[PDB]
Amino acid sequence: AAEQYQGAASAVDPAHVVRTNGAPDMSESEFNEAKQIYFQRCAGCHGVLRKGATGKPLTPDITQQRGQQYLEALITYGTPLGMPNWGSSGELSKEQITLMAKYIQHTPPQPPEWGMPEMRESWKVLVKPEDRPKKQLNDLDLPNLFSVTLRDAGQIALVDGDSKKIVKVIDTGYAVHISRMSASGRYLLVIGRDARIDMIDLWAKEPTKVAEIKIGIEARSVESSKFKGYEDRYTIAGAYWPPQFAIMDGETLEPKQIVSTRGMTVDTQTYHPEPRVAAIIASHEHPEFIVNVKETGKVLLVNYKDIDNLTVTSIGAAPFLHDGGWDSSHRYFMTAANNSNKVAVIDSKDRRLSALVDVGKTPHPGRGANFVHPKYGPVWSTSHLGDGSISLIGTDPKNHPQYAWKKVAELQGQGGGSLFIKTHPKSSHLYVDTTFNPDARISQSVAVFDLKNLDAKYQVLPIAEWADLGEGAKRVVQPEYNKRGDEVWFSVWNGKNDSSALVVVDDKTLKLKAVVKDPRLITPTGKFNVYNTQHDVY
Template sequence: MAGLFASLSLLSLGVAQASAPAMTAAEKEAAKKIYFERCAGCHGVLRKGATGKNLEPHWEKVQADGSKLEGGTLKLGTKRLENIIAYGTEGGMVNYDDILTKDEINLMARYIQNAPDVPPEFSLQDMKDSWKLIVPVDQRPKKQMNKVNLKNVFAITLRDAGKLALVDGDTHKIWKILDTGYAVHISRLSASGRYVYTVGRDGLTTIIDMWFEEPTTVATVRLGSDARSVDVSKFAGYEDKYLIGGTYWPPQYSIMDGETLEPIKVVSTRGQTVDGEYHPEPRVASIVASMIKPEWVVNVKETGQILLVDYTDLKNLKTTTIESAKFLHDGGWDASKRYFMVAANASNKVAAVDTKTGKLAALVDTAKIPHPGRGANFVHPKFGPVWSTGHLGDDVVSLISTPSEEKKYAQYKQHNWKVVQELKMPGAGNLFVKTHPKSKHFWADAPMNPEREVAESVYVFDMNDLNKAPKQLNVAKDSGLPESKAIRRAVQPEYNVAGDEVWISLWGGKTDQSAIVVYDDKTLKVKRVITDPEIVTPTGKFNVFNTMHDVY
């Protein structure tokens, strides 16, 4: 429920109820499940807020002038909360009236007025107890046993089914659908491109070996009860030696063997924020592997701290802590692969980490709630190399000038670490932007917008003339699928390895037929609609080659 209460002044509403509404044990269990699946990602398990607002029954904060600001869900009351949940807000929260029933909306309005439940911790021993080595390394193929072009395979999350679809990008045919954790957040690739690593929001991590005749899950482990990110070690000599995974709950990161997932180490991220306050739930939002050092970049959401974790000696772990801004979320590399750009979305900033020097390079002010996914890199005709991000809370895409050591780009140095242009979108609610070195198009979605036509479309900018309005492609109509009462959200443009196709997920409800709509990047015409009864709520897509080499 991203952005809940974004435009509300809680003090002006008055106290609607003195105590929390009563709930049965069965109602609490049902609400707890919905909250985990739909709300915890933005508002936190303890409901202290991050991308979304604080959802505690009562909270208070001492401001800089010493005055006390108070608020909470109890001040809003059940009816007001029902309206917010049903119809969404301009702050990036979608309307849930086509996702939840009226009874479920009432249930959630009452649930968030009750004190949050605190889940159990998850130790290294808990990880070890959950670990399953299904196929030992010595029993796996010594060479690729199929004829599929692995570079052009797409790993596609089937969110609500708890599965991952591997689709052959050359033939547009489903290769294999495998069980994974619930709502896989990302898929990452081994240095060789052989293994697909997934992490579900329920904390389950898997390795899928694509060298078998059919893709096979060879190991699984659980990181905790809520997770978002994994990545392998990529530095020369350490390729795939280790895998790191970050959890939302408990707030920690874990290090495992890269080929077997055997747990090795767990490190807590609880501690002080950049404002000097202790936070009990600083979640690990995103992790990437440095290209130039044996390090991972670990972004801790609530504290605003960026950790550079050196994996050369796990017994004597060395970590560099870089202060940036709250609340860190997702991001990607600039074109040089030296700077990691990460959204501090509740602070309306993008932090740039110089992985060569191990220091913060810049904090760039942006429009409201930047949400880049990995972002997108291209050479702007006026400002040189730029990295871009869309916004959940504003109707623009921000282009940020990035440094380059190439002499031909020296003339653009004066623009570095500034937003040099904002591309106008039809509304807020963007999640992902994407382009490709071989393309002249820049794609942006808007799935979190409450308006059907906006959410069901993607927008394509011409990079030869960025002042032109983007072309709208209504993915839902282009799919040829029957009309649906629920909004079918068009999400996450992803290029194929050749850079001449763009794949869009059409994310319908559980009872609606969903699809992957493939567009020709040059003509912007539909090439193929991939649909099947097993294609249920598709969201993130990751092309093997582009993910391996951070092509975006």
């Protein structure tokens, strides 16, 4: 009966369902050799399913159309639009480039999914809530503590701000991307690019891990609920693969909900198989999380008032959403759609897109830099990877409606390859790095502007040279203030077999203050001051 009920023909026409191949035959060792190169060298931009970069996707319909020789030449010489040259540079051999061309003509191999069973299997409560201290069992000045990422070591070091000494090094997931604080200021949350999250109790005799869990195969962001009456309630994390985000117990990390970001794009409104989750930021206006979904250019407002029945408001922005942060008032999310060269303004109160501001080539603000301009009122700034400009955008609809969501002015730095711009309420300086600048000297130093005289050109602080480290690229990255706002820290991100350091500068004088060296300080990248991260002070 039920077999006759569901027994008619599918409305889908067999003639339009296509079998995939006609690709160059390659053995198992040849396919694995190419596959290994693809995730080590290509995937980052192009993605798992090869639809992550601008331009045409590397799926068999397009690649077989181009042909073996077209592909080999394209991989060999690259393009001026963001596709590196692998043959000319001499990175890959002609035998490898040949394998790569044949490889992308085959259906993309499939990485495993990662749901609730996998999540729970990896979930570990190391110290039960009840077995945790009721008070701070140490003498540490937690607010002024710095959570520094020792990238290649798969660890993080807690550095005491005033003493400049490493208080504790902790094993974490590989290459931790960011550190975030719980609203109470007690727990420290870190997540590795391997999607493994680690919750750390700063009140323990020695700050230690109390729980851990893996939320995907690849990830970048984590965050805690910051709405009033929700301290340490929920923790969210966004993954690159699978395309999803997960919500967990903010006290134990127990997985509760998992949502897929696979969907329709904002621009063409077509289906995208891999919309990776970028930045995530907690709302202060409503009990919701603001999630950035890259490839589809959507900003989702995930309400956690009722975790059992999840309500999500999908706001369209612009393609390629990445990093971003609050305006001075903590109401408007200033996030960059890098490859679209725009900054999306999300109103967290009224819950809508306030504007799409045209900025420079490939905006990369991190969380951005907020400061009051002598003429244009309160602005939010961002530097770029594509060029040497710095965009100042008005963020005061109330008192400065004429300058709101407008690129009010522009500043010029040392050049492109910039990654982070920084300032502080108590500071009158504006720092900007240039980490990926092709020039060694430029990439090994930072620019500083005088907020009291913006017409004047920037000064150049020789960070890497001050560290006195010897050989290596010595790339300087991310300025970060201490709780007081009179010290600015920088990482001298050198190789793993080289010597790296953390340089500190007296903000009041712009003079070298201290240098943090230690054999354990391996490949330091992101630094997050506890109080400043927790209270979004930027």
